[PDB]
Amino acid sequence: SVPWFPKKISDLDHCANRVELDADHPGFKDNVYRKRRKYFADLAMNYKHGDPIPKVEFTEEEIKTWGTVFQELNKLYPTHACREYLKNLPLLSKYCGYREDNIPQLEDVSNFLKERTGFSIRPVAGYLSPRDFLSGLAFRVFHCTQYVRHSSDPFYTPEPDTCHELLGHVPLLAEPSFAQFSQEIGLASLGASEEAVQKLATCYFFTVEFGLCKQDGQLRVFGAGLLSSISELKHALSGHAKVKPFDPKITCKQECLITTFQDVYFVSESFEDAKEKMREFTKTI
Ligand SMILES: Cn1c(=O)[nH]c(=O)c2c1nc(Cc1nc3cc(NC(=O)CC[C@@H](N)C(=O)O)ccc3[nH]1)n2Cc1ccccc1
Numbered sequence: 490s491v492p493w494f495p496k497k498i499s500d501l502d503h504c505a506n507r508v509e510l511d512a513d514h515p516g517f518k519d520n521v522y523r524k525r526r527k528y529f530a531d532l533a534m535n536y537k538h539g540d541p542i543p544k545v546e547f548t549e550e551e552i553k554t555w556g557t558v559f560q561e562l563n564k565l566y567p568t569h570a571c572r573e574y575l576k577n578l579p580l581l582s583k584y585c586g587y588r589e590d591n592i593p594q595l596e597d598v599s600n601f602l603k604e605r606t607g608f609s610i611r612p613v614a615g616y617l618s619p620r621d622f623l624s625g626l627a628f629r630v631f632h633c634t635q636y637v638r639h640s641s642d643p644f645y646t647p648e649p650d651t652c653h654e655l656l657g658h659v660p661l662l663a664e665p666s667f668a669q670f671s672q673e674i675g676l677a678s679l680g681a682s683e684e685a686v687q688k689l690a691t692c693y694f695f696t697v698e699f700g701l702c703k704q705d706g707q708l709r710v711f712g713a714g715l716l717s718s719i720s721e722l723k724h725a726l727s728g729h730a731k732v733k734p735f736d737p738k739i740t741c742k743q744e745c746l747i748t749t750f751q752d753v754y755f756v757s758e759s760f761e762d763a764k765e766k767m768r769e770f771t772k773t774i
């Protein structure tokens with residue numbers, strides 16, 4: 490039989506909450522950071538569709554961490570990011586307050602995206618099942634972290650944080666072709682088999698999180714996981730990295746690495762082409 494799936498955007502209230510630092514977390518021994526993280530998780534747990542996303546007063550330390558990462562990544566984007574990223578990034582600086590000394594609010598970003606592509610943000614406490622996470626995309630909802638990485642290492646995070654969301658994900662959700670591509674991953678997942686959902690999540694991971702694209706003959710980055718990580722952003726376009734064409738039947742067999750660089754990156758020819766390839770693929774699963 491078919492598992493429950495959301496039929497309208499407010500139904501995400503029933504799965505957005507179906508989500509403690511792991512031993513190796515840089516804030517693992519810090520009580521104050523631990524408290525701040527509980528503060529953020531509660532905001533997400535108490536959020537209901539229709540609410541304005543609670544605005545957060547970020548600490549001076551949190552803003553410095555953002556500024557440090559932001560400054561270095563922006564040096565690299567012109568020569569590393571795909572053109573769609575570069576086109577949208579300045580609109581966000583203008584309308585959502587992206588600055589070295591200011592962390593943008595998820596509510597302003599959500600309002601900006603609703604205008605551009607109908608995408609919206611939902612604060613999320615932590616990891617959801619792939620079924621639940623992808624189901625949000627069906628309604629152009631991106632489940633998004635609101636907390637900031639620990640200040641001890643601004644250049645590394647073992648998990649998505651809001652720097653990753655804002656710098657890695659948001660500029661492409663503002664792009665119509667990318668937004669369509671993403672939504673169709675969500676739509677395909679609704680009520681799909683467990684196997685199909687895992688395959689869709691892996692395709693998502695190697696496009697939305699770690700995808701490369703070819704533009705005017707050059708390899709560029711569009712994956713959010715690359716766009717928010719200085720070392721892997723550089724590595725991915727280095728001579729050494731193993732690169733293959735995006736092909737869902739093959740890509741979906743690849744393991745998704747969390748604690749290390751990826752072993753392989755997949756190149757999409759364009760968002761339109763990736764979208765077409767997923768359409769062909771979803772027919773088979
Ligand atoms: C597939 N899926 C799923 O099934 N359920 C979800 O809940 C889910 C999800 N995918 C996401 C979004 C996501 N972005 C990621 C980005 C990375 N990697 C990086 O950012 C590399 C950065 C780092 N090494 C650095 O130092 O910069 C790893 C995992 C990620 N998951 N999420 C949301 C989410 C929210 C909190 C924790 C985990 C996942």
Ligand SMILES: [Fe+3]
Nearest residue numbers: 649698713714
């Ligand atoms: Fe991500």
